[PDB]
């Protein structure tokens, strides 16, 4: 019902590649932060 999503021409029609959300991205960001420090402290003394 939102007028921003109304499409009148086929220019903005595309296939759905994947989907994502907030609860997934928060955990993903935390994991990506911690893995970096873990690997860095593993590689060097």
């Amino acid at each position: 019902q939102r007028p921003e999503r109304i499409k009148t021409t086929p220019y903005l029609e595309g296939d759905v590649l994947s989907s994502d959300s907030g609860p997934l991205l928060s955990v993903f960001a935390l994991q990506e932060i911690m893995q970096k420090v873990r690997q860095v402290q593993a590689d060097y003394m």
């Binding site: 932060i33 970096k36 420090v37 860095v40 590689d43 060097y44």
Partner: protein, 100 residues
């Protein structure tokens, strides 16, 4: 840091003080100079050097130790007597590529 007063023999204390001065100098200048020269070298020779070790979220609480400096003085290498052929052999062994 914490500074306090203790006991030490003079010949050992001289070495300790020199090492502390070197660590402070590395914290101030040497790491930046080495990184900058490395990126200039990679720019000329088409090499992408990594800087991942300096970007984790604990980086502001880190003291860096760097045992070796860059750039290297070439006159040190070229002051060895009659060393032209050895330098040529080392250059070939380190830089020459393979092809068809």
């Amino acid at each position: 840091v914490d500074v306090f007063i203790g006991a030490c023999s003079e010949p050992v204390y001289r070495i300790y003080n020199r090492l502390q001065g070197y660590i402070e100098a590395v914290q101030l200048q040497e790491l930046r100079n080495s990184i900058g020269w490395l990126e200039r070298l990679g720019h000329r020779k088409r090499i992408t050097y990594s800087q991942e070790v300096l970007t984790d979220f604990r980086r502001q609480d880190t003291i860096w130790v760097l045992a070796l400096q860059l750039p290297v003085n070439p006159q040190v290498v070229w002051d060895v007597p009659r060393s032209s052929i050895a330098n040529l052999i080392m250059n070939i062994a380190t830089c020459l590529p393979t092809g068809e």
